């Protein structure tokens, strides 16, 4: 399918509240780079998403050197130790309601589990 | 080699372990990386574990040398054995 | 695997090559490193060769991402083929 | 085998900027203080300890790239600029003007080093 | 890079994976090795798993080539997809 | 820390064939002769030296695959067959019936080892 | 690490060096392999050099252990220092 | 182009005389596996050739474990030390008169150089 949506503007602490509520939204600038693009699967979208993030000066500076390297190859950045859950140690993309960036958010593993659990 | 404690690693050897982790960070998957990370968490015994690598304090350099410095100061402040010297 | 042209490398793969070079940077000797550096100079074709790695301009980030970005811009500016896409 | 001696000289934020000229760059005084009276198995051992101390000196380390600092941290000499290399000699070398007297030791590029020993 | 299906591996690439396992075989610990072995068991889907590596039948060669050949024949015999071609 | 003692027992071309039964396989006599009166820092040290000697014994090494011989050569226990593993314990273990008395040491699969310690 | 002489390598460490060479044997190119091979030739000082690896004598096993045995016997027969022990 | 030719039968010492005259010929059994196959370049043919060799029981047994591994990934086996020449340390394929297996032979680097030199 194709990526659609506008996303939202974010500050210098974009994923600051990824472990609360529904997490952080897709940054508008990132949505502008992925919009109207086709992806074989959501996993492909996830990979492209993170790669785009590492190319955005304002967002990349919000991550350590090791996490930027991960995003650069399409992998999700590692979360803080306190936010992991078992072997799930990297940020995950949650579908609120599959390429509608306005229905996608970035959440920590711990929060992601709580969401689908009613919390 | 993957020693059992910080006392078996000279500062330089620990840096080599960090660069191996940096290499796995960019590998296709995290299968090998996560094993190296568990080992890092195990031997450092720092409460923040991997955060030392992925969420460095702003009071020090985000680099292998900075990571070694923080571990060194923390282990000294807690009366734990330091790197091999 | 070591290709022979930038056009065989995706930006991601090139980063992996840069990570391999960083690992050998901390190896006991430069035997392997120097071979990886010759390959880098050969495929990049940038006049300053290894300077992109060890002496990055201040107008760019000293990181694998910065290195790839500068190569990408320099090659495009000189009409040479870019990273695999 | 012997002990390191000497006081070295003060340096600025462009320490190795002239490593490719005259006798090159001197051993920084702060570095000399950390190596003085230390015993080394060989000069190669001194060289490793030397670069390692350089990587720990805030003012000096900031003068190098991330990749070069990693080299010094494990005791390897930093890579020179491409224009200062000589064949397979691509890293800064330590030159003795007159074995562990830090005041007779300087840092030079391989290119310059070769010319020094050939009356240039 | 560690794929997730035999169909992603050419016979050559699979041999490289077997060589990586042989290298970890002689490593100080089995931390990395065991992860590579789990992956091998997962993608091959052969009931005897690691036995193909450590306990090869006598009717075949104890070598990377023999391992690939047996997997190839066993998978084909069971209608499962073969190595990338 | 201590010295290895014991004579071990003679074995055939199927040494570990019964490592998954009773008390397992005994320390081969030829192996005991090579380790007797040797001093070891710890039992783990004995274990490494043990497997290494096994890799050097022509008659025993031929009983293992190329991959398993490489393991023993560096002092690691050979991998067991898949059917004899127990969770993450996938290599032969050394069991003490009654620390360096080779006549009280035997080789057992992890599966069997666990049952031995649970009255089985 | 790549030591300078056989005396710096324990038998096990030398085997690890051989498995690294086995891994490079199957790599896409021989860039890294040939550097490891030159190192092997240099430290062993055996007149047949790489033949020990690629053309093993029929009087011994074609394996890392057999290679170490031959080197060991040759260096002893020639009054040269042996592996670290 | 396509591979053509019959090749010739060889003994248990196929490359025994690769350092003499024009070297060793393409084994008939190997020619039967490559005949009528297309290759993007000679380098592709070279890679396929060596891979085929490692699959032939009668030929592979003529090589050490390390050399079989090389051929298995399409690389030429290393020659004996005495037969190398500078950085050319692996067997090379010589064109006698580019996919005619009857015009192709396996030679050592040292011999290959001498051939094109009139020796
Ligand atoms: Zn969700
Ligand atoms: Zn000099
Ligand atoms: Zn027990
Ligand atoms: Zn020719």
Curated annotation (Swiss-Prot), chains B, C, E, G:
What's in the keyword line of the UniProt record? Bacteriocin immunity, Plasmid
Which Pfam family, an example, fits this chain?
A: Colicin_Pyocin
User: Quick check: keyword NAD in the entry?
Assistant: no
**Per the UniProt entry, what are the Gene Ontology biological process annotations, in alphabetical order?**
bacteriocin immunity
The record's annotation in InterPro entries points to:
Colicin_E_sf (IPR035900), Colicin_pyocin (IPR000290)
Ranges annotated as spanning the membrane: none
- Belongs to which family? Belongs to the colicins ColE2/ColE8/ColE9 and pyocins S1/S2 family.
Q: Please give the name of this protein.
A: Colicin-E7 immunity protein
UniProtKB/Swiss-Prot annotation, chains D, F:
Alphabetically sorted, this entry's keywords are:
Antibiotic, Antimicrobial, Bacteriocin, Endonuclease, Hydrolase, Metal-binding, Nuclease, Plasmid, Zinc
Q: Where is the composition biased (Basic and acidic residues)?
A: 86-98
**From the UniProt record, which GO molecular function terms apply?**
endonuclease activity; metal ion binding
Whether Transmembrane counts among this entry's keywords is no
Q: Which domain of life is it from?
A: Bacteria
Identify the stretch(es) annotated as Disordered.
Answer: 57-101
GO BP: defense response to bacterium; killing of cells of another organism
Query: Can you cite an annotated GO cellular component?
Result: extrachromosomal circular DNA
Cite the binding residues for Zn(2+): 95, 113, 117
Give the protein's biological function: This plasmid-coded bactericidal protein is an endonuclease active on both single- and double-stranded DNA but with undefined specificity. Colicins are polypeptide toxins produced by and active against E.coli and closely related bacteria.
Q: Which family does it belong to?
A: Belongs to the colicin/pyosin nuclease family.
Annotated protein name in UniProt: Colicin-E7
**Organism of provenance:** Escherichia coli
Phylogenetic lineage: Bacteria, Pseudomonadati, Pseudomonadota, Gammaproteobacteria, Enterobacterales
């Amino acid at each position: 399918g194709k990526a659609t949506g506008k996303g939202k503007p974010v500050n210098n602490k974009w994923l600051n509240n990824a472990g609360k509520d529904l997490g952080s939204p897709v940054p508008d600038r990132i949505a502008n780079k992925l919009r109207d693009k086709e992806f074989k699967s959501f996993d492909d979208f996830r990979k492209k998403f993170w790669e785009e993030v590492s190319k955005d000066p304002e967002l990349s500076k919000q991550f350590s050197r090791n996490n930027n390297d991960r995003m650069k190859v399409g992998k999700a950045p590692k979360t803080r130790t306190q936010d992991v859950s078992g072997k799930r140690t990297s940020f995950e993309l949650h579908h609120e309601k599959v390429y509608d960036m306005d229905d996608i958010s970035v959440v920590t593993p711990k929060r992601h589990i709580d969401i689908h659990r009613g919390k | 080699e993957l020693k059992n404690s910080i006392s078996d690693y000279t500062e330089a050897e620990f840096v080599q372990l960090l660069k191996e982790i940096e290499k796995e960070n960019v590998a296709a998957t995290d299968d090998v990386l996560d094993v190296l990370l568990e080992h890092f968490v195990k031997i450092t015994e720092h409460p923040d574990g991997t955060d030392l690598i992925y969420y460095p304090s702003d009071n020090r350099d985000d680099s292998p040398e900075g990571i070694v410095k923080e571990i060194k100061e923390w282990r000294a402040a807690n009366g734990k054995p330091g790197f091999k010297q």
